[PDB]
């Protein structure tokens, strides 16, 4: 339902990041992608979001195609998918309680279950000392796993996330990637991008490798 075929985003400048991608991802599978600095995979995950057009090929996401997408149908698809990204920004000069609760007013839930879902997800983050404070009050390491805990809350059907452990301990990394099979124990999609080959060679990973838009560089590795 997520199969790529003959798609690639052309750039108006002198460099085009991706040439050709064609792959199918099975449901309920833990996915990992890797590459060098010239390789394009953040545009590959942004292609699933598609805030700009792919301008080549045909792509499928369920019944509604990604090609020729309308403004009136996009934010129903955006509100069911929880995406965090590496350029870390949040609502400056507010508390962190409503920052976690940002999509919960969008979907619409009553008040007495808003606060208990904050504390139930924050226990794996080890932020019981700071539950209601400013985003600038948090650490530079702490504010990524707040955004990771944003993806944990209200259980999205599709999850994308970003490159995690940007500023987290290698010891405390083992608890956050242990969370991602617990949230993928039911029928979701997990697309964690990682680069440390030591910690991603433990269990079943598809291990897609990229170099300058070349999708076919590694096998299934199962």
């Amino acid at each position: 339902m997520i199969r790529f075929e003959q798609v690639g985003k052309r750039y108006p400048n002198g460099h085009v990041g991706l040439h050709e991608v064609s792959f199918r991802v099975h449901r309920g599978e833990i996915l990992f992608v890797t590459g060098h600095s010239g390789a394009g995979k953040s545009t590959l995950l942004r292609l699933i979001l598609a805030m700009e057009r792919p301008t080549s090929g045909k792509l499928l996401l369920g019944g509604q195609d990604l090609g020729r997408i309308t403004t009136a149908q996009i934010p129903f698809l955006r509100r069911q998918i929880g995406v965090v990204f590496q350029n870390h920004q949040l609502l400056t000069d507010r508390t962190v309680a409503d920052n976690i609760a940002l999509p919960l007013q969008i979907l619409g839930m009553p008040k007495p279950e808003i606060a208990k879902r904050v504390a139930s997800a924050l226990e794996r983050v080890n932020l019981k000392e700071k539950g209601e404070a400013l985003p600038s009050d948090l650490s530079t390491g702490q504010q990524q796993r707040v955004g990771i805990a944003r993806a944990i809350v209200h259980q999205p059907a599709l999850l994308l996330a970003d490159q995690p452990t940007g500023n987290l301990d290698p010891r405390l990394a083992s608890e956050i990637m242990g969370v991602f099979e617990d949230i993928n124990r039911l029928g979701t999609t997990v697309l964690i991008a990682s680069h440390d080959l030591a910690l991603i060679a433990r269990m079943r990973h598809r291990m897609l490798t990229l170099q300058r838009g070349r999708i076919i560089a590694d096998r299934e590795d199962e």
């Binding site: 805030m51 403004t71 934010p75 955006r78 920004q89």
Partner: protein, 303 residues
């Protein structure tokens, strides 16, 4: 749902007042700008509605005078009084008698110790009618039908500036029409620039709530009450300056009218026009917020 719609409006309302309390120097600074521009077109319109109440002084010049002969009878005097008032382009016809004409010279320096030699009062009664409109050129053609009366002794007009009162009037009507176009159009630009630049400010919060979901109404809701409460702050800060200004200038007009023998001065301000002034400031910030956000949402459109 309807329950989720009311909670979305209520949470955006209470966040706006918490935003309004924050930055107390900056929130009060743009509130005075929102009021002091609005105080000019409604303030000058309140002046023009107050000046037009005083209409007796403007309709006092160019009064036509007719002189009777030596024989005086008052019963044709009231007959010519009501006949001119039946004809249009009048305000009111008044006639004073010979005894009134005798009396008004006696406080004056003329007619001193002269009625001992005079066997009777020879001053005829007069009419004094001012036209209600001054229209255009061609109002000198009323002279031949005022000579239609059988008793005409003098018709001493000053013929040059009766037509020229149609030159001074409608010069000022076009003069205030110059400013009631210019001050309204400079009101629409000052409001339309500051609200649009607020959308240009704080730009980072829009894309972080758009890629995770959200509609166009949810992003517009913290700015719509932001546009409304500054408009609500505009009408209050307009209200204190106009009440201070009308109290400041009321001493001069009562000094002029008391010397003129009239009870004229600057009137107060209404409550019905007061509520109409404030809802205009609310709707202007509401309309200006809708046109402001449409540029930024089209800049990051999915297309």
């Amino acid at each position: 749902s309807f329950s989720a719609y009311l909670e979305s409006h209520r949470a955006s309302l209470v966040d706006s007042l918490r935003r309004l309390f924050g930055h107390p120097f900056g929130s009060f600074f743009t509130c005075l700008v929102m009021g002091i521009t609005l105080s000019l077109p409604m303030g000058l319109s309140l002046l023009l509605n107050n000046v037009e109440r005083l209409g007796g002084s403007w309709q006092r010049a160019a009064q036509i005078s007719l002189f009777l002969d030596l024989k005086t009878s008052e019963n044709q005097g009231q007959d010519l009084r009501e006949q001119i008032e039946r004809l249009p382009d009048v305000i009111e016809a008044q006639l004073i008698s010979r005894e009134q004409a005798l009396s008004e010279l006696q406080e004056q320096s003329g007619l001193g110790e002269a009625l001992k030699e005079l066997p009777e009062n020879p001053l005829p009664p007069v009419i004094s009618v001012t036209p209600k409109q001054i229209d255009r050129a061609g109002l000198e053609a009323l002279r031949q039908q005022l000579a239609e009366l059988p008793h005409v002794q003098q018709a001493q007009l000053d013929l040059v500036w009766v037509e020229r009162l149609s030159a001074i009037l409608k010069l000022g009507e076009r003069f205030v029409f110059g400013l009631t176009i210019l001050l309204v159009l400079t009101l629409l630009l000052v409001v339309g620039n500051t609200i649009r630049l607020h959308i240009e400010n704080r730009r980072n919060e829009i894309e972080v709530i758009k890629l995770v979901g959200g509609t166009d109404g949810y992003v517009r809701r913290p700015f719509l009450y932001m546009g409304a409460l500054y408009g609500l702050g505009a009408g209050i800060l307009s209200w204190a300056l106009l009440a201070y200004s009308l109290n400041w200038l009321n001493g001069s007009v009562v000094n002029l009218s008391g010397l003129y023998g009239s009870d004229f001065g600057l009137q107060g301000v209404p409550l019905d026009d007061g509520l109409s002034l404030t809802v205009g400031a609310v709707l202007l910030g509401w309309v200006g917020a809708w046109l402001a956000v449409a540029r930024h949402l089209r800049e990051l459109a999915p297309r």
